[PDB]
Design a protein around this ligand. Structure first.
Ligand SMILES: *C(=O)[C@@H](NC(=O)/C(=N\OC(C)(C)C(=O)O)c1csc(N)n1)[C@@H](CC=C)NC(=O)NS(=O)(=O)n1nc(C2=CC(=O)C(O)C=N2)n(CCCS(C)(=O)=O)c1=O
Length: 500
C-alpha cells in the first residue's frame, strides 16, 4: 500500500470592473485522467471511450499501449462538466475525473487587453490576469490518497492542506466607458483604413484608468489560433514619438522660467529655421509673429524651438520627466514598455529643439495620458492605477498650480479659438487639448486632452496608427474620436455641462 498526494486546483479570484460588473469568472471544467494499467483490463471499452473524445480509435489505442507502464496519463483537459459526465456514463475502468477551472470573460474582446487571459493551467498570461496573478490565484489543495503498485485510487483518507480560493479584484475600468471607447476606436479605424490604434481614459483626480482599448483586439474566450498581433496591449507596450502633443510641457517649462508670458511674441517667419545641418520646419509656413497660444494653435515647431533655445533644454526635460514621459509607470505589467526620454549633460541646439517638439522621444499612450492628467489636475500627478482607488494617494505637485492653470487655458483656446482644432470640441462643455502627427510615408495620428476645461475630470489620449486616407493629421483623424468619446464619458459620469 502506497500513501500519495493529489493537488486540488483553487478557484481563481473574480475580476470586476469598478462597479462590480464581472470581467473574468472561474468556470467549472472537467479534466479526465486514466490509469493505463487499469485501462488495459477493459480494452473492449476503448473505441467507445475514443469516439466519446472525438479521437481515431487506433490513434487512442496506440496512445494507451505506449503508456502501459505509466501509472497516470491525461486523457483530456477542460471539457464542459456535461461533456465530462458523458465520458463518466461509459463506466470505463481506470477513467477518473478532476474538477478544474477555466476562465470565462463576459465582455470578451471589449476589455481583452486590460483584463488579459490565463494559460492552460489557469495562471495569468497577459494583462491584469498576469499582473495580479498572485492575488487572483490563491493556493491549491493537498488531498491524501491511498494507491497500489498499478496506480489504482483506493480511498480519500484525509485533506492534509485545504485549497484557498483566490481573491476578488475590482479594476479602475468603468465597463460603460470601456464599451464607448472600444466602439468609437473601432469605427475610427475602419473610417480611416488604419492599421491599429489605442485610446486611454484617465480620472485626473484619482489616477484611475477608466478605459483602455486597442485595435486590433481578440475574443479571449476563443483563443484557438491566437494571433500575437491582436493580443498586444498597444496602449502599454507600443512606444511612439509623441511629437506636437508634448509642446504643452515645453510651454509649462517656458512659463515657469520667469522669461515668458502667454502674450509674448515669437517670429516664426519663414516657417523654417536652420541649425547647422538640421532644418526645423513648420507644416504651414504663412506666419511671422505668433503669441504663445498661437504657437500651439498653429503647431509651430519653429516657435517652440526658439522658446526652447531661450529657456534651455534642462527645464523642458525636467518637466517631461516629472510628468512621467519615458518613465516607469509602476503598474507592474510584465512586458510593459518604458520608452525613452533622451538626456544630455550639454544639450546641443538640434536636440534641444527636437525634445521641445517631441521628436526622438518614445512614450506609451498610458504615459501620455498620465502626463495630461497631471496638467489637467492643476499640475498635480497622482500615481497611475489599474485597480479601483477608494483612498486616493497623495499626488506630487509636478507643475505649479498657476502654470498648469495657464497651460490649461491655452489648450482650451487650441480647441475653441479661430483656426483651432474645432473637431475636438465637446458639445455642451469647454474641452482642452493638443493634436499631433508623427511621421513614423507612414503616420501616427494623435490627440491628447481633457475636460471640462474649467474643472478637469478626465484626460484622454487617442492614437490612430497608419491612417490611410487623404487626411492623416491628428487634428483631423484623432480629434473627432476624442470629441465623441469625451461627450459620452462625461455624460456617463454625470459631469455637469460647463459651457454655460
Ligand atoms: C506635431 O505633431 C508636428 N509634427 C511633426 O513635426 C512631425 N511630423 O510632421 C509631419 C508633418 C507628419 C511630417 O514630418 O511629415 C513629427 C513629430 S515626431 C515625428 N516622428 N514626426 C506638427 C507639424 C509641424 C511641423 N503636426 C501636428 O501638430 N499635427 S496637428 O494634428 O496639429 N495638425 N496640423 C495640421 C495642419 C495641416 C496643414 O496642412 C496646415 O496648413 C496647418 N495645419 N492639421 C490639420 C488642420 C486641423 S484644424 C487646425 O483645421 O483643426 C492638424 O490636425
Amino acid at each position: 500500500r502506497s500513501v500519495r498526494h493529489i493537488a486540488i486546483p483553487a478557484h481563481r479570484g473574480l475580476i470586476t470592473d469598478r462597479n462590480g460588473e464581472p470581467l473574468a469568472v472561474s468556470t467549472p471544467v472537467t479534466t479526465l485522467w486514466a490509469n493505463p494499467k487499469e485501462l488495459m483490463t477493459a480494452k473492449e471499452r476503448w473505441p467507445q471511450l475514443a469516439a466519446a473524445l472525438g479521437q481515431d480509435t487506433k490513434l487512442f489505442a496506440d496512445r494507451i499501449e505506449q503508456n502501459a507502464e505509466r501509472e497516470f496519463i491525461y486523457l483530456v483537459r477542460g471539457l464542459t462538466p456535461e461533456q465530462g459526465e458523458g465520458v463518466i456514463a461509459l463506466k470505463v475502468p481506470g477513467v477518473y475525473s478532476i474538477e478544474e477551472f477555466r476562465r470565462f470573460y463576459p465582455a470578451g474582446e471589449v476589455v481583452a487587453h486590460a483584463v488579459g487571459f490565463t494559460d492552460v493551467d489557469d495562471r495569468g498570461r497577459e494583462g491584469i490576469e498576469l499582473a495580479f496573478d498572485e492575488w487572483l490565484a490563491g493556493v491549491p489543495g493537498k488531498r491524501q490518497v491511498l494507491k497500489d503498485r498499478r496506480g489504482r485510487v483506493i480511498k480519500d483518507v484525509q485533506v492534509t492542506k485545504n485549497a484557498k480560493p483566490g481573491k476578488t479584484l475590482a479594476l479602475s475600468i468603468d465597463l460603460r466607458l470601456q464599451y464607448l471607447a472600444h466602439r468609437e476606436l473601432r469605427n475610427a479605424l475602419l473610417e480611416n483604413g488604419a492599421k491599429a490604434g489605442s485610446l486611454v481614459i484617465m480620472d485626473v483626480k484619482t489616477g484611475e484608468i477608466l478605459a483602455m482599448t486597442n485595435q486590433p483586439t481578440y475574443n479571449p474566450n476563443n483563443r484557438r489560433n491566437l494571433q500575437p498581433a491582436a493580443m498586444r496591449n498597444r496602449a502599454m507596450i507600443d512606444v511612439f514619438e509623441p511629437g506636437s502633443t508634448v509642446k504643452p510641457f515645453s510651454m509649462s517649462a517656458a512659463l515657469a522660467s520667469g522669461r515668458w508670458k502667454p502674450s509674448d511674441i515669437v517670429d516664426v517667419y519663414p516657417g523654417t529655421l536652420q541649425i547647422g545641418r538640421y532644418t526645423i520646419r513648420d507644416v504651414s509656413r504663412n506666419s511671422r509673429q505668433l503669441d504663445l497660444t498661437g504657437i500651439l494653435i498653429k503647431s509651430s515647431n519653429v516657435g517652440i524651438s526658439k522658446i526652447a533655445f531661450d529657456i534651455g533644454a534642462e527645464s523642458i526635460y525636467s518637466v517631461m520627466q516629472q510628468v512621467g514621459l519615458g518613465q516607469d509607470t509602476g503598474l507592474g505589467f510584465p512586458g510593459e514598455r518604458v520608452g525613452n526620454l533622451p538626456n544630455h549633460r550639454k544639450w546641443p541646439k538640434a536636440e534641444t529643439a527636437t525634445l521641445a517638439y517631441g521628436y526622438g522621444l518614445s512614450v506609451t499612450a498610458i504615459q501620455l495620458a498620465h502626463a495630461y492628467a497631471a496638467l489637467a489636475n492643476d499640475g498635480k500627478s497622482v500615481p497611475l492605477s489599474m485597480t479601483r482607488v477608494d483612498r486616493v494617494p497623495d499626488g506630487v505637485q509636478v507643475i505649479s498650480p498657476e502654470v498648469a492653470s495657464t497651460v490649461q487655458g491655452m489648450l482650451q483656446q487650441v480647441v475653441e479659438a479661430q483656426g483651432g482644432v474645432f473637431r475636438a470640441q465637446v458639445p455642451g462643455y469647454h474641452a482642452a487639448g493638443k493634436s499631433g502627427t508623427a511621421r513614423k510615408n507612414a503616420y501616427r495620428s494623435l490627440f491628447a486632452g481633457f475636460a471640462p476645461a474649467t474643472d478637469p475630470r478626465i484626460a484622454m489620449v487617442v492614437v490612430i496608427d497608419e491612417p490611410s486616407k487623404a487626411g492623416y493629421f491628428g487634428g483631423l483623424v484623432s480629434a473627432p474620436v476624442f470629441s465623441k468619446v469625451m461627450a459620452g464619458a462625461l455624460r456617463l459620469m454625470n459631469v455637469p455641462p460647463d459651457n454655460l
